[PDB]
Amino acid sequence: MASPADSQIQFTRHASDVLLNLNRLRSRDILTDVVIVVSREQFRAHKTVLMACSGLFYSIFTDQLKRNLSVINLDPEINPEGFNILLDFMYTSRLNLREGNIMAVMATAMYLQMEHVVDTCRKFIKAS
Amino acid sequence: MASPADSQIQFTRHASDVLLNLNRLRSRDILTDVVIVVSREQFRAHKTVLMACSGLFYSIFTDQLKRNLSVINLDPEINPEGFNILLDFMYTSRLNLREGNIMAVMATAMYLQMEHVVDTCRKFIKAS
Ligand SMILES: Cn1ccc2c(ccn2CC(=O)Nc2ccncc2Cl)c1=O
Numbered sequence: 357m358a359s360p361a362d363s364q365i366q367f368t369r370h371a372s373d374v375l376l377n378l379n380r381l382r383s384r385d386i387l388t389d390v391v392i393v394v395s396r397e398q399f400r401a402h403k404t405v406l407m408a409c410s411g412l413f414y415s416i417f418t419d420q421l422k423r424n425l426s427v428i429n430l431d432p433e434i435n436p437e438g439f440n441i442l443l444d445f446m447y448t449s450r451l452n453l454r455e456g457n458i459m460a461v462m463a464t465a466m467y468l469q470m471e472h473v474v475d476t477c478r479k480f481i482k483a484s
Numbered sequence: 485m486a487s488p489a490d491s492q493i494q495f496t497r498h499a500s501d502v503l504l505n506l507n508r509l510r511s512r513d514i515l516t517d518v519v520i521v522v523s524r525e526q527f528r529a530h531k532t533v534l535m536a537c538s539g540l541f542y543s544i545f546t547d548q549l550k551r552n553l554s555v556i557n558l559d560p561e562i563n564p565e566g567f568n569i570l571l572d573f574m575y576t577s578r579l580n581l582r583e584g585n586i587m588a589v590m591a592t593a594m595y596l597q598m599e600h601v602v603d604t605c606r607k608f609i610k611a612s
Pocket residue numbers: 407408409410411412414469470471472505506508509
């Protein structure tokens with residue numbers, strides 16, 4: 357006895373509402389379970405959201421060896437501004453690309469294994 | 485120095501992709517942190533997603549007194565089928581309403597404090 361997801365009532369704003377509420381929990385540090393250290397800066401997040409948005413974080417936390425880490429030290433060459441823009445993106449679906457930050461954002465998205473964002477960065481370069 | 489979310493590049497499928505990947509993590513029991521007990525049945529979930537989708541779970545886990553609970557026993561009158569349909573909805577944006585399940589689903593959504601789903605249930609009744 358079943359009901360295929362395809363025949364069910366679609367709530368067109370549900371996914372966007374969930375992501376906005378996850379961002380609100382991040383803003384209040386509710387159930388955050390990791391600190392991402394990026395040179396002199398620290399960013400708290402939900403490992404579930406990191407894994408949902410990044411090949412790097414997916415590959416780290418899917419491994420039972422690293423599943424329970426509370427601190428991740430990113431590569432020391434990663435631009436914290438680049439990382440912060442992408443973390444915002446993960447929690448908002450909005451990507452802040454500017455002439456001043458495109459190379460930092462693109463290099464960081466390559467490291468985080470966010471292929472659709474890297475492609476978008478290549479589109480932004482083609483448009484400037 | 486800032487960039488308002490409103491002037492930023494919108495990824496129209498990002499929120500839906502995040503929610504599908506959270507559902508995949510739930511399907512593999514990766515970083516689930518609660519068991520919801522509903523009479524004879526048990527359902528594992530992510531407290532962050534429960535809080536994002538339900539006034540009842542928001543109010544429970546926002547309280548530092550209950551923030552760390554690993555087990556929630558729902559009211560013994562809650563229909564496990566009703567609960568399972570709504571948990572699926574939380575993780576998919578798809579709501580399985582049928583003549584056979586509408587009253588169970590609506591009663592459960594009232595208990596979970598999911599006002600937009602209760603309203604939709606009232607619309608389904610008006611249409612049958
Ligand atoms: C190249 N690459 C690799 C991974 C990736 C992206 C963009 C987002 N993600 C995360 C992801 O797929 N997570 C995931 C996949 C299956 N089950 C659960 C989860 Cl959480 C990417 O571009």
